[PDB]
Amino acid sequence: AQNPNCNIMIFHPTKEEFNDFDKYIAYMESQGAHRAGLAKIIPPKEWKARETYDNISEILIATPLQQVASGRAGVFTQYHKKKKAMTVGEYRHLANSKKYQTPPHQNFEDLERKYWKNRIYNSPIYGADISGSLFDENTKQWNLGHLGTIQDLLEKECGVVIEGVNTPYLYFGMWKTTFAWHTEDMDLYSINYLHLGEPKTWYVVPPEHGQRLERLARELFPGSSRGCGAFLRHKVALISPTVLKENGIPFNRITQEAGEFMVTFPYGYHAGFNHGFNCAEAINFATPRWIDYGKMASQCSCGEARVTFSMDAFVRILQPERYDLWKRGQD
């Protein structure tokens, strides 16, 4: 078995290897990359996402989210308070202000220490889930707006034609902005490109050990657990690497820098934070190996978790028994 310790693997494809997206994902998995839950892909030196980022300041963040924490430094939840709209130029200025800017630090490890010590005492503002893309239409390789769709994958594998679309989302971050412990909708893959700015640090639990994280989460957030059998779908819970180690949860960590791709694999729980002002683009995708994970994916039916239009068909076809109750998530 490849990669039995479930290490995060880093790949350096050649420009020739960067042509066929599906083929390279399959290659990564042949080397055991999926066992970690997360992989890094460094693009060929000849590749670029677009020419420059000089003209992005007029993009609108219609609903910036202030991430307010509750709990203790290593075990907390966050809720998202809606703020007034602002442009990316305005957001960048805010990120760089004295109130919100990255503190002086020695290295990534020093900044990580500062994050877990002090995160809960601040409320950074995030521009998340903004439909759009910053890939040039002429970028032919690993263009996240030009991937094969999940709906076409399901049709190719299972022969059923379904409604729905999937398109990329942009994320504008600042120091301490946080993504909570989660797997993707329907335990899909995700791919994330860091277009510009400061790094993003990731934590990940191997898919074969996901239930260990779930059990700890139930212990650490007992009221939330009683409210919903899949409350990590709410994407609001944080657990520090120190607390994971104290409880024997297997995990790994890695820092993503501008110009690098990360791929998360089916049922790979992940969480993380941004180092400073940055912009990332991400989208979900599927492969034939995903189908069995989609069939088994937990669902939130308490009504808290966000439901995309396109997830309906996934639940309807892959989980027909759960569909009525999940669809009771409704409204």
Ligand SMILES: NC(=S)Nc1ccccc1
């Ligand atoms: N072990 C790492 S980090 N990467 C890698 C990628 C391809 C082939 C062999 C090794």
Ligand SMILES: NC(=S)Nc1ccccc1
């Ligand atoms: N062709 C589609 S829809 N997706 C996909 C992605 C990676 C590998 C194989 C297939």
Ligand SMILES: NC(=S)Nc1ccccc1
């Ligand atoms: N290196 C880190 S992240 N250490 C740490 C220890 C205790 C509390 C918070 C962080």
Ligand SMILES: O=C(O)CNC(=O)C(=O)O
């Ligand atoms: O970048 C973020 O804030 C969160 N991204 C992801 O969870 C992802 O790409 O799967």
Ligand code: NI
């Ligand atoms: Ni994710």
Ligand SMILES: [Zn+2]
């Ligand atoms: Zn729920």
